Structures are given as structure tokens and as C-alpha cells.
Amino acid sequence: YPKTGVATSIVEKIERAEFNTAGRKPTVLLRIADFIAAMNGMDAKQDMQALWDAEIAIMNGRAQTTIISYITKYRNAIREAFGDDHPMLKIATGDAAMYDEARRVKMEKIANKHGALITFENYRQVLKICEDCLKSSDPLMIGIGLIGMTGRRPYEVFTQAEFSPAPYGKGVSKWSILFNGQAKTKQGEGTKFGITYEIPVLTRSETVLAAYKRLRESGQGKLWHGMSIDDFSSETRLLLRDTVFNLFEDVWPKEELPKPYGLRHLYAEVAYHNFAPPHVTKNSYFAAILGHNNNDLETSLSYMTYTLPEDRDNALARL
């Protein structure tokens, strides 16, 4: 197995921070860089164990989700520098109790939300705002409009979505399109990786499909295209966050702050309410429109957080 190599992506990010005008030092990227270099020439399992144990010691005071996230970075560096069959990958992982506890915490939150859904009272107003955004000249605003109307992830809308018209028999479908460029698949066998599938939209098909060409053909739109997740996060995340805060501040449900992924949840909740055939369940429909892995009905649970005021009203009428 290889005992020499370099995590190119980490080094390049460090070298760019060399001549920055302001901001934190890349202390974490640095530790990963040094960690990888100290591994060059290492062939003893007990040596590799001592090196990892040291990094783990530093991370001590961090939150559990943080350490879990930080472990992924080290692991991805090792794969980049040494490949997938390096013995370090058996050592540099979280403990089993760490992942078991994270899973437990995760499900507890989802379970708490399923028992206390938030009534999205002004949801039609939120949808209207999103619709108006589709006609904005700021391609950022156009993207936000598309998130609400297509339910696609921000990274998908801005960097890699392929929106095409869906056939309806011999005509073109009015309340659905075709989408390609599903993110997060990890290239799984039963995923939507590289697969074009049909999705519902919350406004006219022609309106959505035209607003996306304006997004694609704009200036910022061509910078965005094909971008890595890290570049997108650094270029657009904080501005999109602030923009979404402001657009929705007064109409979004008081229980929570307005958030980009709030639009993805709402999209599912509204699209089920409007388009779901009677022979499918909510879990199955959610999984279908959100592009989830084959036979997975569990991920859908995460997205169920809202209740439409119309459904609320008559569940209160069923005495």
C-alpha cells in the first residue's frame, strides 16, 4: 500500500489563505496538512495510532457533531493522499459509541418535531414571494425563487441542476419538469446519481424553465456553474442566508428563523397536499419528489416539520 502522497486540495486552500486581507487562520487545515505529511513513510500500526490519538486530543473541547465533521475531513485527506486501501483509514475514525449517540440524538429531534409540527400560516405568501423572485434581475434572487418552486437544494439550483420540460402524453406538463444533478448521492447504486427524474413544481412549468435560463446565462450564474461545494459555500452561503432572512422575516412562522432549507421542507408539504395520488403514502411521495435512495422511507421523516393551515383547520373540525 502507498505510504507517500499529498492531499492537494488541502494544500491549495492553505496557500490561498497565505495572502488574505482578513479572517481566521486555517488552523484546522494546517493540522490536517501536517498530519498527512507526518504519515509519509509510516508503516507501523502503533505509530499511526499514536499520531491519530494526538489529533483526537486536540479536538477534545469541540462539539460532538463538529468532531464527527472534522473526522470526515481527515479521512477524505487520507483518501486523497494515500488512496482507499491505506491502513490509517481503519484507525482514524470515531468510536462506535460516538456514532451511536449521534444517531440517537438525531432521531430524538425528528421525533420531537413529528409530535409538534409548526403551522405554516402564511405559506401562500412565502410561495408568492418565491414566485416574484423568478422575475428578479439579481440571479441570486432567481435562485431563491427556484428553491421554493422546485424544492431543489441550494447547491443544486446554483451549480448543477438541469431543468427540462416533462412530457405529458403528447403535450408538455404544466405542473412538473425533469431534473438532473441530484447531490449527496455518494454515487450509491440505488440513488438518483446521473439520473433524470420528473419533479412537481409549485408554479407554471414555463415560468420556472425560463427563470432558470436567465440564471444560467447571467454572469454570476456562469461563475456558479460546475462549482465545488467548498467554493459555493465560501462565495454565496452567507449572502444567501442574509437575503433569505430579510425576504421572509415578517411572514415566516414565528417558531423558527427563515432558512433556505425551510423552502425545501415547505415544497414537500405543499406538493404532497396538491399533487399526490391516493395510492402512495406521504413518506413514499416525499422520498420520490426529494430524490431519495431506493426503498428508503426513513429520510422523509426529516422533512416533515410543517402543517398547512388548511389541514390544521379541518383536523380541528373533525371534532
Position among 11, 110, 209, 223 found at the interface with a copy of itself (CB under 8 A): 110
Instruction: Check binding of 290 to ligand VO4 (CB under 6 A).
Output: yes
Closest CA to 211 of 154, 125, 266, 130: 130
116 binds, among DNA, ligand VO4, a copy of itself, none (CB under 5 to 8 A by kind): a copy of itself
Position among 17, 42, 117, 209 found at the interface with a copy of itself (CB under 8 A): 117
Q: How far apart are CA 177 and CA 162, in angstroms?
A: 10
Cell digits for 219? 454572469
Q: What are the φ/ψ torsions at residue 184 (nearest 5 degrees)?
A: 70, 5
Write out the E strands in the chain. Answer: 118-119, 162-168, 171-180, 197-200, 306-307
Instruction: Check binding of 298 to a copy of itself (CB under 8 A).
Output: yes
Footprint of ligand VO4 on 122-161 (CB under 6 A)? 153
Instruction: Check binding of 94 to DNA (CB under 7 A).
Output: yes
232 binds, among DNA, ligand VO4, a copy of itself, none (CB under 5 to 8 A by kind): DNA
Nearer to a copy of itself, 25 or 114 (CB): 114
Footprint of DNA on 219-248 (CB under 7 A)? 229, 232-234, 237-238, 240-241
Q: Which stretch binds DNA (CB under 7 A): 44-52, 68-76, 127-135, 169-177?
A: 68-76
Instruction: Check binding of 192 to DNA (CB under 7 A).
Output: yes
Instruction: Check binding of 312 to a copy of itself (CB under 8 A).
Output: yes
Treating both helix axes as pointing N-terminal to C-terminal, what angle do 260-275 and 139-150 enclose, rounded to 10 degrees?
Answer: 40
Q: How far is the CB of 162 from ligand VO4 (least distance, A)?
A: 18
Position among 9, 128, 282, 299 found at the interface with a copy of itself (CB under 8 A): 282
Q: How far apart are CA 269 and CA 199, in angstroms?
A: 14
CB 119 within 8 A of CB 101: no
Closest CA to 40 of 78, 3, 71, 93: 3
How do the residues of the chain divide into helix, strand and coil, expressed in percent and rounded to 5? Answer: 60, 10, 35
Q: Which residues bind ligand VO4 (CB under 6 A)?
A: 153, 290, 299
